[model samples]
Target: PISPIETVPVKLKPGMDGPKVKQWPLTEEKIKALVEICTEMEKEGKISKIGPENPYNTPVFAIKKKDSTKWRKLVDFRELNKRTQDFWEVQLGIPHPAGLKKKKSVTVLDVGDAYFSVPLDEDFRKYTAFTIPSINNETPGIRYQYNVLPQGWKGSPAIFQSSMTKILEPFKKQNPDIVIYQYMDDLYVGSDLEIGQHRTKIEELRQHLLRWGLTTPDKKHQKEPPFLWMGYELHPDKWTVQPIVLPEKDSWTVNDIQKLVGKLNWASQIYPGIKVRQLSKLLRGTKALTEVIPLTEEAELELAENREILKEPVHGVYYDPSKDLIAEIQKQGQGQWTYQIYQEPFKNLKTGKYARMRGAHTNDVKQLTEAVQKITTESIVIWGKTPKFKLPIQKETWETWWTEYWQATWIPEWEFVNTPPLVKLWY
Candidate 1:
């Protein structure tokens, strides 16, 4: 190790000789200050009982490349290297692409922001590149860490992480259910939840992010293939292959539809009635059918006067053809909607039990009562039926509660509004 420098460099100030300094020993005053800070930090569980090394226990290290003479040997922080207590708050739970493709299930939840803390000791410093603090730590100085990005300082990741973590605390507090697992910013949430629950959870998360100082991109978050977290894509559909988008260049046209019809007809010729029935139904209410028919005298007059109003007047015209077709097929497929296949409410459903403390500052009985009321009202709206519940309200306003309960009991409407394309078209 090098000897302690006689002077400390002044930041951003270059000089032939560094700032002048005296060889002053660490005095009693400095020691007393250190002791006071250490006592306060220890009370808050930020420091260790043992020396700096034992207290931090940071999982940091340097590596020897395979090409080096001494390879395949593990390295942990020693005197030259060190690590500190590393705490992280935000994690993105990503599933591996291969794992997803292999039919692995993934639940995705997005967190807004959070914090993490890592030691700046030697072992970690060698490879760390940076260090940062998460949350409001008692330890003060600047609340971050970093490495030289260009000349390649030894601690960039720690710096990046430390800076980002401090900014995420508000977000994490907002989203209690948003899963922030071990490092790597991966999230875990429900992919298998019913439509109602899934939508509720997503909306809740969105609101939480809004409350925090962060934002989630709707387009990116709502994509078919979920974003990578940790190492996996947390897809709700659990689709093995990434969904394809029909770009403007490759979009279907009239000719494409015609070609598709030809192929479909040819492929189903053995079942002539099936193809004929389907085509006949489509043609009956569409402008395409007019192509095969001669406009009558009265119709011809109308067409001549208002030619733009031709498609609807002609048997089969669809605004969004493919989308409409899917809707039509779903409408035709079901004789009636049955709960047999769509039974979710019947699951071990419990509502309005005693909801305990909810918010971070919820300590009083009044707060708990209010929390329950809020939850019950929102739950009935999202879950469709009024859940049997009891609150800690002193007066138990049964009638008032009933009115609110029934008013919010619109799960069916919510379900209709939130149905996805696949569910809506395939029903």
Candidate 2:
């Protein structure tokens, strides 16, 4: 097949969005756990409930300053954070994907949301800004772990994460391979394989959480996926699946194309020069074109071919810029998308080249653009806006022969008709 003139890897996938774990008040059970923990602290003197009605406030501590000279008192920073930072625990609401994977063998771990690390003080300030429900101040701690409830309190997630981490430490040591991550209780865990190692890791991880007093509700009606992971969906075929659908608020019309154009442009900036025909159509009104641009260019068709493949079997990476670096660039904005690029020589566990690439994916256009701009903040971005024609030369041709070879090689030669009648001569 003749390769197309250009190609564009469209980012049809949306950004990860959902309630975070750390974004909510602790449950009654968790509160009790916290209380039990605080009561054992040697540094803590007097402890009491921070709020009366908040069930989350199972414990609170009258923290004494390391230096007595600095006057201190007990206070919950939870309320403070809700108020100050645009803090939302995006993880609270989503059901875990692990259950779905149990039914489907080849689980694809789709990350529908990401974590923005908020420090203790910032989280506290953010929480303090808002009023919250689920206040049960009268709940008492099991032991001397008098802790504040999750009312209109600040610093709740921080306190909770800290306490829970300590509680889960023993579990961590046991299931070292099982990945565990949480930004304020927006917990996510996964392993490389399922069954055998994966099964063992998950069970051990589960036991660990139970031991630490954290409970995950067993899923009741998890539909089998082509694959499943964490709390998200990943489509290998890129075909739209109902339960894990994309944003359906709009359409597949020209307007949607316009939006896609914008996302594509930003996405392409990292690796541009693929969508010649589409770009030509997009620029029809702005640019002078006596005649319609034909889509006959083999180069352009290659791009379209790639686009089709990416639509289904494509994979991608997002840019995650360092917060400090973003602040330095003053590129904090909602619509902004940022891409960070760093490279280190490839290394092996035995003889390490110590090479690695620091990268991230972002759909926030503003942030993404600024990130591209900021590449020069440290080192010049060596390759951005790479054309579709160049990708084949730079990297192996993906979504084409590479995949075909895999399909042909993965099974035995006898599995399919590979030879005709050459063996008859020997007979």
Candidate 3:
């Protein structure tokens, strides 16, 4: 094939023979996708017939294209890939996109079928052999072996990263000033601040990438700056750590629950309230991915809290010690107030919860208005009863202002303030 140069050949560990990993059932939609890729890859010579073998017929899985049209073929090479271990981390020597800050703009290019671009050693094609389920009958189906590097093999990452780097070296050498941060195949191309010249550069690199067998489909091709990448949002100024939208459905399998549990577990780093121990029950214990998990009261509540956490617009609160901390409160306190008074013996509220009271301390109704504005621009929950506004102004006057001028709706206040766990005032 027309590859730039030879990287390390796809080789399993010496003397390791992997048994067949049975194919997981695919939906009718998945079957259609599975067939399309096999036919397509075979035609391109990326994959070929596995007619003589059955023992190592590894299973294949397909995920829908993020753009919602095509399907991506991936060998469930985990079982086969386990035969050897490839240990490597992000190369420190390579320039990272992290240095590019306040990205005036960026052109995120989606390199298609990157792993397939790297050719495989024909001798080891059997190891990459993958099979899909037969659509017609409930039977084990035909095997197709990857003649090119298959996605999902562990070694492929390290191997391909180096190869792509070397192959794409000239592009970097030609335009050292332009930032073309290529991690494996995913690229972020742009500069810190440039007018029209930078726009031209984005296209130049994108079109030039095609020559290296790197095609950027859907490269129109700007994912807005606040777009997420490598586990953080690369904003115009800072990196914000936020949830990557957890997977969901009506009910979930043990495997599905596992993805939710362990995936958000990474989010547990900042979602300090989340506990791994609480999610232990949802783990795949003697259960199969095919079966749905029985919801427990404990499990359900645990899920509720996390789903709620994801529901909120979570972001880092930038606190500057140098700046004066002027804490203000609303007359209603729902929006802002002059003075906030949280009650003691917290169980006095209607729902057996704590409540908050407010009034003017260094303030007027005008200051109360200012307080709400301070909190609105300088913004920043709890509940059950629709507590009436305890304002210093004409109740109807500010309530009318709240609904009309302020927030569109005066969400009835439900007092559920934290007792000892809550106290942050520096007025």
Candidate 4:
């Protein structure tokens, strides 16, 4: 039921060589499956048989599904990509979660097989060609080409982004109360209405998508609290989001390290303070297929720190260092109390003073009271610090909490500041 959108023709880079032709060997069973799939797709107008005389052909390969007996059809488009220039499509970035804390309800929906549904420009379909043998070698093998947008092509993501944005614009207009955020195929619906009313908005969204020939799987529709969007777990109750990490090998090849670093880089959207320098170093002087780099001491340490930091969640504070001012309070006593203070970034939105303090021992209520009075233009106070109850008072509060709580302060005597590099390279 997909309404194929005619896409703009792909533009390849200039000064490139002509057509490339490559063939892939396939198992008997795999070949049969591939033929069946291509045959069905051809009938559905998703693909077509190219004339035997067609000059351009790319290799086709079958990728096995993980832990399953299924195969995914993949085409080698690298040669085509190399010869092609940029399509120059404007790409919209993923939405920021910094302001989502105030919304009362949220919904997450995904477009099923988003890439396969969009069609290609009729004129450009010839550029996407691959060959497959006929089942049982009934006749000379035929070359097949995609009529729809093909995966593995360099410009695929940009093409899909442009098409999807245009398709969803009307829905966004109709439901002004609902804030829709799209990251490729993933869509997040954020609403400030009551939970019951919010669910109805999603149903309306489904209708909008249906009209546009987009479908969301029944199981993929989540309309409730703690919605998992992108790579972070969003909690409505705590007004916080945290990245989820799973087990990984101790040692990794250059390719594996790159994948891990990519995940971590995405996570830095939520955890802006993450350090990726050590992990990126692993990419230097190495080839993905041949080099296996065991985690260096620094890389291992960076990975461990990231794991620990991700285990803790951070509040949705719209921090802009440019506007916010900082003040440090030092108390002289048996145990000195040192803490940093900033007038809450959005004090008018919520009546609370925000502070990120290390755990400190303070005996003088009057001094703490005076410091609190200076910053607390609002009636309430929100204290943020690290959490681990058993540690020393200062260490336990290493993590910053964004909530109304009692204030404590502590600081290491000396702070280490990393010096800037003389020159930055574009790696």
Candidate 5:
């Protein structure tokens, strides 16, 4: 029999008023359907009828099943969740999907009806009770509560992860060669071996899962390449984990930024070294999804910078950044003085790794010159396409500025690069 973790029972905050109960409006047909499912659940010992005097109660609602007209019952446990004093942090920090290198084979397993597999603490079930319409007119309405971990419960996820972790421990110990990564109901068994060898590991895990009362559908057991791992398209052949970018408007609202940043943060785990701090900083004080906030010029530049960093492999050998440079003479024209400086290569101060001047530009040569002087202290390595300077000065003037002043300023600082290169030179 499956058992919930009774040792870590959810405790409600003391002296708090019980959750307010709200009746859901349902059509007669839908009401009947909901009752039918509830009755079956009660008969199966998954839930029990409860008394009206219960101190806490949540509302129950029915939603349509995906790709079908059938109804699925759901409970809104937000109020109960709010009052619960038990807090458990989700154990995340899974290795980045991109870091799963050399694992040419993969088997994804999904536990069916995962929550129902674990029983809820008997004493705490009363707090999850919810009222529903009665089957007969004379019976009036009745309250029922789940005996198992119900969906929408605040602590359900953490509890489920804990239980699954314990259940999978034995299999992990037995299969020392196979790497199993589990998050909630999803399971990923990876092996850096041929298909035949990976299949043996999958068979071993399947046996353990069956003995442990976990049911994974045969179709959900996927193996081989071109699979989805933690929402990323994991391509073993290409050695890449690509994120699926959803379509959004050019003018992004507050909600748009929040969601995009969330996805980027998760993807950052897989694609290491890609920082989202500045982009996140833009949304610091804002609330309201529909509030449209256009990207600033600086943000747009950084966004492009992030894209370039994501392209680089997390552990791949570093490439020399000094190979690319260009020099040309331009005819004198009517324009303001703007300059871009590319200094000679130097070693990193911390690791002694070789570094180079990717590109630095500005509308004013003096400002760009000062920025160039701090290149060693600042460690500016421009990643994306360098913006073209539109200054109307002659090519001879540009040449003289770089050779005489810019070069003289940067020659001393070539000794040490203490920090990661600045994404932008002008800012």
Candidate 6:
């Protein structure tokens, strides 16, 4: 298909509004630097000179760009950002990461400045307006509105990725042999074929993207095994996921914590659904993005647990249908009945011994599941403990009779005692 020449539209919660900050927060020299930054932005059509009469306004500030000659103009949209209505979830366009199990190689492509490449729908433009105390030292100062997507808006990346998906949708159908995986601007096209095969499709896709005015840098193109896409270390033998390590810091804001957790969440693609279950406890009921809070007892403990998961990632096993799979019912005391499913070990020809596989359809048992859920944080979950056994009760004499009935006299080979709950039992 084609990437439409359209802007992204946004909705907001009614009756929600915030005031803006002026250049007062900046040093004298930075104000002049801010004007120059806007000068370039205005010329590039990323921003436009606007009337000071706008209702919504956020402060404008500048920070030194990483090893760059110029400063980066950042709009403090935190106020308005909180009220925006929609958030794009990892749904249809992005497939689960586990599906990449056996791909020989993955060719990842990146779209530079993917967010700014799209324009913000005009009707909502005023909501993004930021004040500049002065453009060129004009008496009353000046105001400029964003003509395109502004950085720091949480919704920007999703809007960009959706547009990019449309651009690649047709290319995908044209070549069914190729596989596609995307997370925002980063797109991977590969198959279970040779690296050369995936590389050819990569080159073709890069050429096709130019038609949509999208350009990927040739400098950092990845086309090999153990591809590190979306914070995952993808090896054919195993799946390794880790969080991005940042420089040490004394305190972390809600935004900082969210970002760290965000990196860890890439695991959710390969993992069943445990990504949020582990983090929900720490991030649950937490608010205020910029506000920093002291870590509580649970937060401290969960934070360490979060760190441990990334450092020593939980291994994921690919399923093998050929092997024998077995599931058995058991009790872990109480009414918590458990069940475990495992692929029976197979004999190895060389060692003359049984060998197991990593990606096997194996799991540990739990108190049933979510009672039917898997927690990725746990190493293995073979058995389920839900659906309580719920037995009837008689008396002490009944309990003795029931054991004798199953026994008839004890056998040396096996002892199949019921591993169920409480003092109540029957013959």
The candidate that wins on lDDT is 4
Superposed by TM-score, candidate 1 places the C-alpha of residue 265 at a distance from the truth, in angstroms, of 51
List where candidate 2 sits over 4 angstroms from the true fold. 1-79, 82-154, 160-162, 195-200, 211-271, 274-427
C-alpha lDDT score of every prediction, in listed order = 0.28, 0.29, 0.50, 0.51, 0.50, 0.47
Better TM-score candidate (2, 5): 5
Residue range 93-147, candidate 4, lDDT tens digits: 3334444444566665655356676778766677787877645567667678778
Clashes of each: 49, 103, 6, 10, 3, 16
Off by over 4 Å in 3: 1-7, 13-20, 52-54, 57-59, 76-107, 112-117, 135-137, 160-163, 178-181, 194-200, 212-218, 221-237, 240-427
Worst 10 residues of 3 by lDDT: 377-386
In terms of lDDT, model 2 sits at 0.29
lDDT of 5 by residue, 1-427 (tens): 4444443465556566646667554446656767888898888778888775675567666654322346667565546655662233223222224323336666655453666766777777777777676445555676787788665564664566666667778876776665555433345566766657676667677677776766542332355365432221222333122233333457778787777666667656545665777778778885777787655667765676776665554442332444332111111122221122322222111111112233443333334333333222112122211212222234444433432233221122111112232221111
What is candidate 4's CA lDDT for residue 243? 20
Which of 4 and 5 is ahead in lDDT?
Answer: 4
Evaluation by lDDT, superior candidate among 2 and 3 = 3
Model 1, span 1-427: residue lDDT tens = 1222221111211222211111112223333443454355446433334322222222111122221222111111121121121121112112123222122233333231221133233323223221222233434211111111111211222233434455446655654333332122223333334545544555565455455544441222344374432222333332121111112223334444344334434323222222323332333444542234322445334323332321122112212212211101111122221011111221212212223333654433334323333433332222322233322233334212321222110111111112223322112
How well does each candidate superpose onto the true structure, as a TM-score? 0.20, 0.29, 0.46, 0.40, 0.42, 0.40
Best by TM-score: 3
Q: Scored by Cα lDDT, where does model 1 land? A: 0.28
Residue 313 in model 3: lDDT: 35
Model 5, stretches more than 4 Å misplaced? 1-8, 13-23, 27-29, 63-66, 69-71, 90-119, 133-141, 160-163, 174-207, 214-427
Q: Model 3, range 109-197, lDDT digits (tens) per residue?
A: 55434766767676666776777787666665767777766665645545567656665677778877656554333455656545565
Please write out the lDDT profile of model 2 over residues 1-427, one tens digit for every residue: 1222211111111332211222224344334443443444224322332443332221132221221222222223333333322333332212223332223222211111111121223222222222222346453323221212222222233334445567558766765544444322234354555445554455555555554453442231246463332332211112121221123323334454444344444434333443534544643454332323333356445445545433332122222222111111112223322122222211100000111123342323223222322232112111211111101011222211221112110111011122233111111
Kindly provide the TM-score of model 6 when superposed on the true structure, using C-alpha atoms. 0.40
Clashing pairs in 3: 329-336, 329-337, 330-336, 330-337, 331-337, 383-414
